Amino acid sequence: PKSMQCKVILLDGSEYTCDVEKRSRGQVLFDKVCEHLNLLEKDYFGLTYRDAENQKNWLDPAKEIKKQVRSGAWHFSFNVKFYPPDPAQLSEDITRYYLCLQLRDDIVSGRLPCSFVTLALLGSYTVQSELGDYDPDECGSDYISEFRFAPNHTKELEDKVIELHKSHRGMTPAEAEMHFLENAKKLSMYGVDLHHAKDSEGVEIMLGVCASGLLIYRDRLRINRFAWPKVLKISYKRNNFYIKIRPGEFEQFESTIGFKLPNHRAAKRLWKVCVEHHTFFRLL
Ligand SMILES: Cc1nc(C(=O)N2CCCC2)c(C)s1
Numbered sequence: 001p002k003s004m005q006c007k008v009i010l011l012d013g014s015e016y017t018c019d020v021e022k023r024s025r026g027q028v029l030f031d032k033v034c035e036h037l038n039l040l041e042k043d044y045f046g047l048t049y050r051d052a053e054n055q056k057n058w059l060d061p062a063k064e065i066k067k068q069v070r071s072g073a074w075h076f077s078f079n080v081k082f083y084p085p086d087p088a089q090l091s092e093d094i095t096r097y098y099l100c101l102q103l104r105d106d107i108v109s110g111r112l113p114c115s116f117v118t119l120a121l122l123g124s125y126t127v128q129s130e131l132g133d134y135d136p137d138e139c140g141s142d143y144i145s146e147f148r149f150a151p152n153h154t155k156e157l158e159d160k161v162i163e164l165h166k167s168h169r170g171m172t173p174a175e176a177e178m179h180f181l182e183n184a185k186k187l188s189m190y191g192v193d194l195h196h197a198k199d200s201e202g203v204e205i206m207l208g209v210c211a212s213g214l215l216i217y218r219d220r221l222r223i224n225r226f227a228w229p230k231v232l233k234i235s236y237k238r239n240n241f242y243i244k245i246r247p248g249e250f251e252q253f254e255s256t257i258g259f260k261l262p263n264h265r266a267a268k269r270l271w272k273v274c275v276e277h278h279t280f281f282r283l284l
Pocket of ligand 1: 110111112113189194206217
């Protein structure tokens with residue numbers, strides 16, 4: 001039985017290495033990573049890989065790994081796939097912990113925009129969880145944390161993290177992580193997967209996929225929002241992505257909205273993430 005080496009980047013930035021039989025389905029590798037992580041609430045997570053166009057793709061757990069990575073390296077990341085709208089309802093603290101690690105990367109990367117005060121508050125909960133109670137011995141007037149808190153760090157932001165960290169004395173790691181999540185979950189881009197597209201007129205938009213539905217960001221004025229229950233059919237054809245919006249009360253016909261994606265693979269990827277979100281968030 002021939003086995004392929006897999007390398008998985010974990011949410012703490014470390015690398016997990018294991019072997020699977022070369023015809024293994026994605027679920028096999030995912031089960032190994034999740035056991036390594038002592039993770040039981042596995043439904044929120046998945047593995048990504050980079051395709052031959054260098055795009056992030058979800059590893060389909062039901063399909064052979066080799067028919068997805070194809071010509072590419074067996075290199076993956078472990079990621080949150082479905083961001084829980086109410087992290088307090090997850091059954092395990094360790095689930096909330098991995099969700100915090102993902103969100104920290106969402107913030108530092110700039111995928112999850114955040115005000116100065118919310119960056120400092122989230123940072124303060126991370127420090128409380130990671131180091132425990134504020135200690136002045138590890139912080140003079142010139143302190144800069146090893147923790148990455150933001151896409152761009154300033155001395156002012158470092159100072160505000162410490163000031164709020166001082167307020168959290170006696171907070172336990174699970175408590176600080178829950179506070180982190182209670183704040184993060186409110187951010188307007190929380191759990192929004194953004195896809196570049198053009199509308200039916202050729203105007204550049206972003207489509208966001210999340211728990212509450214599909215978001216169509218045209219400009220700062222008028223953001224179109226469509227709740228999953230308002231969506232009956234999601235389809236792609238060539239470079240095109242279509243959603244079938246259900247008839248409003250007393251309307252005779254479903255309405256169709258068309259988008260142009262960069263290429264056929266980008267349209268299929270958007271279709272699959274929409275179908276998966278619709279199914280997942282239909283059951284929650
Ligand atoms: C507040 C918003 N930001 C974006 C955006 O283009 N983003 C790219 C990085 C994450 C956000 C929208 C589409 S709405």
